[PDB]
Amino acid sequence: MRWKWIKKRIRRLKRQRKKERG
Amino acid sequence: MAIWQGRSLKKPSGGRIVLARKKRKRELGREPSNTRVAEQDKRKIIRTYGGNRKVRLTAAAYANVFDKSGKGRKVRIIRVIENPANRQFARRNIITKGAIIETEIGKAKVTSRPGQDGVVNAILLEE
Amino acid sequence: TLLDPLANALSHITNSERVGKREVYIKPASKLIGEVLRVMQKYGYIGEFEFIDDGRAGVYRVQLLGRINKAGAIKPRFPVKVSEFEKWEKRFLPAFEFGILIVSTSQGVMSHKEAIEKGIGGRLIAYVY
Amino acid sequence: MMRDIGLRVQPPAEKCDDPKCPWHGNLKIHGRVFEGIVVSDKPRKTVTVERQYYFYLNKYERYELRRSKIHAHNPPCINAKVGDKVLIAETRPLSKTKHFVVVAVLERAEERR
Amino acid sequence: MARMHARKRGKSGSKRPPRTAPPIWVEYTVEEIENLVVKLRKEGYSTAMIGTILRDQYGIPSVKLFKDPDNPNRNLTITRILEKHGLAPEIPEDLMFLIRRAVNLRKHLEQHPKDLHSMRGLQLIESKIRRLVKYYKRKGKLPKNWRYDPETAKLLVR
Amino acid sequence: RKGPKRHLKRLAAPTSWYIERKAYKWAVRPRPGPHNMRTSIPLLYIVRDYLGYAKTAREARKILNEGKFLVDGRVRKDYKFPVGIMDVVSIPETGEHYRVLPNRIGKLILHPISEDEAFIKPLRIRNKRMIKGARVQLNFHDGTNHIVSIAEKDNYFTSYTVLMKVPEREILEVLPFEKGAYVFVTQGKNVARKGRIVEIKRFPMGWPDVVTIEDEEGELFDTLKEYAFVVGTDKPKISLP
Amino acid sequence: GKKAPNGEFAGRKLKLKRKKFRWSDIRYKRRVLRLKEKSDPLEGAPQARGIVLEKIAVEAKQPNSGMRKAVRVQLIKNGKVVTAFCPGDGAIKFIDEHDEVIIEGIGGPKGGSMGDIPGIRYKVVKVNRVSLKELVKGRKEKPRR
RNA sequence: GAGCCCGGGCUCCGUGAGGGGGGAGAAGUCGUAACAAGGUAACCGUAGGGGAACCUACGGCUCGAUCACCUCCU
RNA sequence: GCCCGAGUGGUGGCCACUAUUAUUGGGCCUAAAGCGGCCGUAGCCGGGCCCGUAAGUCCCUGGCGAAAUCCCACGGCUCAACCG
RNA sequence: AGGUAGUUGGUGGGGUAACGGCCCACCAAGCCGAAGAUCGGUACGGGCCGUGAGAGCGGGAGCCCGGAGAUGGACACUGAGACA
């Protein structure tokens, strides 16, 4: 679980933060 | 003409205070005046809201003097020299409650408000 | 540190009580506690005490009859009007009978019942019943 | 200059006060009286006294600490100093924020907080 | 009894004599006692150790009990015996020993700086000084104009 | 509302007159006159409500134009007349006198006494001040002003007992208030008590200036010199007899 | 010390504590801001009239299936799209498209559609200023336009 | 000395292609992740990698594993 | 058949229940929730013993917090509401 | 989370029914703030009101009391009084 979520949250964050940074 | 009060400036704590009413008649005010040195006397009577007529001097030609016994006169004056407030005023001869002026013999110090009372007399300065 | 030395007296005295030892020892000692035990004895709740004043401290050795149920100090020590007494009457005490809500007063120190008979009040100090 | 002020207090040892003191002119002593402590002397003839009082809260049964600054005009006959009680008169306005004049000073070298 | 400060460990239970007036099987005059004190402060010993040697050699456990009454304003004891003579350090010994030590630390750290623990007691000794300062100011052994710092610690010691 | 308040409501009508409170939506409002508004009583009221002589105000007003009442030994006709306190009011068509006295309670009541006491009206004067022409004058807070006292004080500060010959508009028999004299209390929550003054010792700083008194009962009353009114050395009757 | 400062002058701390900790009641917070009043259209109101854009039927929830009668109505001043649950059996009949339909809530304003219905926050009372429970009974009045 | 206007800046209301997630619907598909040592104990913070569940490294923790083997403790 | 009764019910809001906002009168090992640990500023809170003040605090008096509404009495309207 | 430039104060003066930075000339650099200022939201305020065993919580409706307004916004006369 919290492994999952942390990396899902991180990937969401990055990918989206990539989309914001871009 | 001048509005005020005077509740419409700022708070002593840097708040903005906003007016939450309008004008009140009783609480309006008039503008300052220039009482000139001249040979003629230009007066006007004006009616206050307390219901009392008060004289405004718009010019004058006689002040005149007092000692430390107090023997008054009505005689000629000449140029206003030294006004406390601003030296600009001492050029255009604006009489004030604390003005200083040249009289016939000795300099004399004004000691009355001619913008509500309508009077000009002085007391001699001793060197 | 300590504070409320009284209270740390009282609280022993009660936890002392609840066990059913014979007598107590209270290492820190004072007027407050001294006086309060005095008034306490005056109502009778306790038997006899001796304090020995050591160059360190007063100590009270107190004799336990069995009477006391619960006797506790007040936390912020509230001021209480003589009209508000009845409220503080119903709350803290167990019923109308007991009446040692020990307050501190203009006259000195008293219980609740000794306060009411005079007629005077103030800030609360402790309770006993 | 130097006349009895009443309140059961004595007037300053020296006098030479300007017309914004109740020993001259048309500004006069009247009314209620307080006491408080000098924060600052920095403005000219002007001194901050901040009072401490307690207030009650009915909900919690307890008190609170509140602190009301009051602006006080010091007469040039006497100088205020930090950290001493000062006595205040209730008078008509000097200014936007100055409604008070200092009447009788009890001065002190001591300071807490 | 205890206070586990910067520790979890209960403090020593060392305890005073419950004597309130002094032994008379021990015998010294107000004059003799005063000499003993002055001699020891002349050595370079300090008041705790002065009270220590007097205890171990001359058999007086605390000075207050023996001396007072001889001017019953208060108890007469070592440094109050010293101040009347002018032998007292204007800094209280408490505050002095403290600061004294402190300046020694700094020199170690100077040369050795990779020291957690040694760094961490610098922080633990200053902050006792600070306190000891703070209250004295208000009591008055140290003027209110002072404030504590590591250059104003290296000046008091030298 | 930024002009003058020229109506009064019943609910806004003060209960120191014992008016009826919900009779209508509007009460009779005193005009200015002799004495204070929430210390007075309207002529209308004494007629319509107090003494029943009216049903409608068309009655009362007629009654006051013809002359069933004189106030202060003098005729009236404004049917909005505040009748003063400690006051002389006369019925001339029957020969009645009432004092406008406060009760213990604090409502305004009329207390009936004979015609003889209706020539005298104790004044304690509200202030005393110099005027031009080198005179002083005697004030009151029912307004009534008198001139003459033969230069300077000759008597007391303001706590006076005056004898006013009320039909004659004249002042007679001046008498101070002293530390064994009588006082009637007209203002305060100690009203309707008449007593013997213990002393006049005071703590004057600021507004309060203290005067104590103990009555026949012995109820210690602290009133202002002003709330205190000098009834004299005892002449008119006490309220609640 | 069980939390709180107790002490004469401390109270202010108390006074701010409560308030700080009050805002953990969703309901309280929400009202004191007015989120109840801003979000779930109405502008807060008891009820709202609106024009029946169309009639739609939706499915029931988890253990359930049955065709609930729902309208789509547009509130008129609110100007917001509301899908809605209609009381009664036959009903969907008596409601013509483009009659006025007054709308209310149903079963706590919280958002809670009743157990069966997913969405529906709201209720219908009326068809052309005469209600639905009056139109389930034949006699009482019958509809127009 | 108002309203009024003009040029710019900042903010807010009605409304818009497109875009994010939630509580769901539980008849399609992939896998077996966890819950039994779940069939490689599990979790944990950090880092990389994989379609997914997730795997691995390093450090921690037992809320840890089943006998066995060894060691202590009323 | 039960309730209530010219009412009864629906939606909405507020308060109670909710010691689910803890003053009265809540918790926080594992249920939600202890900061990874310390320091000390502001704050709150403070051992004993004597003396001054009486600021808080209590007691008494006195000025005062309009009427209305509330509570109690008596009186009025047939009764009560309502009013005096 | 820092705000403040008639801005805080001083001297002298104007204007006003009148005190006052109300306004103004000169001089000074204060004034306010974590005991929460400033800014933003929301809101007439009070008597009361609802509820609750109490403590408390919510509320400003008739009515009374005080203030503000009169299509938005400014402006004077006339009068004791209006900026009506």
Reduce the secondary structure of chain E to three states and give it as a string.
CCCCCCCCCCCCCCCCCCCCCCCCCCCCCHHHHHHHHHHHHHHCCCHHHHHHHHHHHHCCCCCHHHHCCCCCCCCCCHHHHHHHHCCCCCCCHHHHHHHHHHHHHHHHHHHCCCCHHHHHHHHHHHHHHHHHHHHHHHHCCCCCCCCCCHHHHHHHHC
3-class DSSP state of D77: coil
- Verify G-C touch: 3 or more CB pairs within 8 A: yes
Q: Which chains share 3+ C-beta pairs under 8 angstroms with C? A: D, E, G
Chain F residues with at least one Cβ partner in D under 8 Å: 205-206
Q: How far is residue F152's CA from residue F142's CA, in Å, rounded to a whole number?
A: 24
E102 close to E96: Cβ distance less than 8 angstroms: no
Q: Which residues in chain F touch residue D6, judged by CB atoms under 8 angstroms apart?
A: 205
E116 close to E70: Cβ distance less than 8 angstroms: no
- The CA–C1' separation of F172 and I12, in angstroms, is 78
Residue given tokens 């506790």 in the structure block: C72
Q: Which two tokens stand for residue G49?
A: 């009239």
Minimum-distance residue to J75 (CA–C1'): B23
Q: Verify if strand J has an atom below 7 Å from the CB of D8.
A: no
User: Per the structure, how many domains does chain G have?
Assistant: 1
Chain-centre distance for alpha carbon F5? 25
Tell me, yes or no, if C78 comes closer than 8 A to chain D by beta carbon: yes
F239 close to F102: Cβ distance less than 8 angstroms: yes
Strand I nucleotides with an atom less than 7 Å from a protein beta carbon: 10-14, 20-28, 38-50, 56-64, 66-68, 82-84
- The CA–C1' separation of D68 and J6, in angstroms, is 25
Q: How far is residue G142's CA from residue G127's CA, in Å, rounded to a whole number?
A: 10
The closest of B32, B30, B34, B31 to B89, measured between CA atoms, is B34
Residues 22-61 of D with CB within 7 A of strand J? 40, 42-46, 48, 58-59
Beta bridge partners of F138: F128, F146
Q: Which two tokens stand for residue D59?
A: 């909900």
Which residue of chain G is at minimal alpha-carbon distance from D58? Answer: G11
Chain E residues with at least one Cβ partner in C under 8 Å: 15-20
Q: How far is residue C55's CA from residue E20's CA, in Å, rounded to a whole number?
A: 6
B20 close to B30: Cβ distance less than 8 angstroms: no
- The CA–C1' separation of E139 and I35, in angstroms, is 37
Strand locations in chain B, DSSP E? 36-37, 43-47, 53-57, 59-60, 77-80, 100-103, 107-110, 122-124
- The CA–C1' separation of G82 and J52, in angstroms, is 38
Q: Verify if strand H has an atom below 7 Å from the CB of A13.
A: no
Q: In sequence order, which residues have a C-beta less than 8 Å from that of residue F3 and are 6 or more positions away?
A: none
**E15 vs C55: CB contact, 8 Å cut-off?**
no
Nucleotide nearest G118, CA–C1', reads H24
User: Quick one: chain C helix, strand, coil %, rounded to 5?
Assistant: 35, 20, 45
> Residue G27: which domain range?
1-145
DSSP character at residue F47? I
Phi-psi region at F151: left, alpha or beta (left = phi > 0; alpha = psi -120 to 50): left
Q: How far is residue E77's CA from residue E8's CA, in Å, rounded to a whole number?
A: 34
- The CA–C1' separation of C52 and I49, in angstroms, is 15
Q: How was this structure determined?
A: cryo-EM
Q: How far is residue B114's CA from residue B99's CA, in Å, rounded to a whole number?
A: 11
Minimum-distance residue to J82 (CA–C1'): B25
The closest of C28, C22, C16 to C53, measured between CA atoms, is C28
Residues 57-86 of G with CB within 7 A of strand H? 61-62, 79
How many CA within 13 A on the CB side of residue A6? 3
Which residue of chain D is at minimal alpha-carbon distance from C77? Answer: D62
Residue D75: cis peptide before it, omega within 30 degrees of 0: no
CA angle E133-E135-E141, nearest 5°? Answer: 65
Nucleotide nearest A4, CA–C1', reads H54
φ and ψ of B36, to 5 deg: -85, 150
D9 close to D29: Cβ distance less than 8 angstroms: no
Q: How far is residue G11's CA from residue G53's CA, in Å, rounded to a whole number?
A: 58
Q: Which chains share 3+ C-beta pairs under 8 angstroms with F? A: D
Q: Which residues in chain C touch residue G6, judged by CB atoms under 8 angstroms apart?
A: 75-76
**Strand B36-37 with B59-60, pairing:** parallel
F109 close to F115: Cβ distance less than 8 angstroms: no
Question: Which residues 15-74 of D have a C-beta within 8 angstroms of G?
Answer: 54, 57, 59-60, 62-65
Beta bridge partners of F99: F88, F111
Residue given tokens 């509005």 in the structure block: B3
Q: Which CA distances in Å does E101 have to B33, C86, E41, E106?
A: 78, 61, 20, 9
Which residue of chain C is at minimal alpha-carbon distance from E1? Answer: C1
DSSP character at residue B47? E
Chain pair C-E, CB pairs under 8 angstroms:
9
G42 close to G79: Cβ distance less than 8 angstroms: no
Q: Which residues in chain C touch residue G8, judged by CB atoms under 8 angstroms apart?
A: 76-77
- The CA–C1' separation of G11 and J8, in angstroms, is 33
Q: Verify if strand H has an atom below 7 Å from the CB of A1.
A: yes
Phi-psi region at C62: left, alpha or beta (left = phi > 0; alpha = psi -120 to 50): beta
Q: Which residues in chain C touch residue D61, judged by CB atoms under 8 angstroms apart?
A: 76, 78
Strand J nucleotides with an atom less than 7 Å from a protein beta carbon: 2-26, 28-33, 35, 37-39, 55-57, 63-70, 74-76, 78-83
C54 close to C31: Cβ distance less than 8 angstroms: no
Which residue of chain C is at minimal alpha-carbon distance from E18? Answer: C55
φ and ψ of D31, to 5 deg: 85, -140
Q: Which two tokens stand for residue G25?
A: 């009641």
* Preferred mutation among F202, F205, F207 to probe D, highest tally of D CBs within 10 A: F205
- The CA–C1' separation of B7 and J17, in angstroms, is 19
Nucleotide nearest G27, CA–C1', reads I20
Burial G66-99 (b: 16+ CB within 10 A, else e): eebbbbbbebeebeeebbbbbeeeebbebbeeeb
**D54 vs G15: CB contact, 8 Å cut-off?**
no
Which residue of chain C is at minimal alpha-carbon distance from G7? Answer: C76
CB atoms within 10 A of CB F167: 14
* Last residue before each break in chain G (C–N > 2.5 Å): none
Q: How far is residue C32's CA from residue C23's CA, in Å, rounded to a whole number?
A: 20
CA distance C53 to chain E (A): 10
Resolution for this PDB entry, in angstroms: 5.3
Strand locations in B81-125, DSSP E? 100-103, 107-110, 122-124
Tell me, yes or no, if D4 comes closer than 8 A to chain F by beta carbon: no
**Strand F160-165 with F122-123, pairing:** antiparallel
Which residue of chain G is at minimal alpha-carbon distance from C4? Answer: G7
CA distance D35 to chain F (A): 16
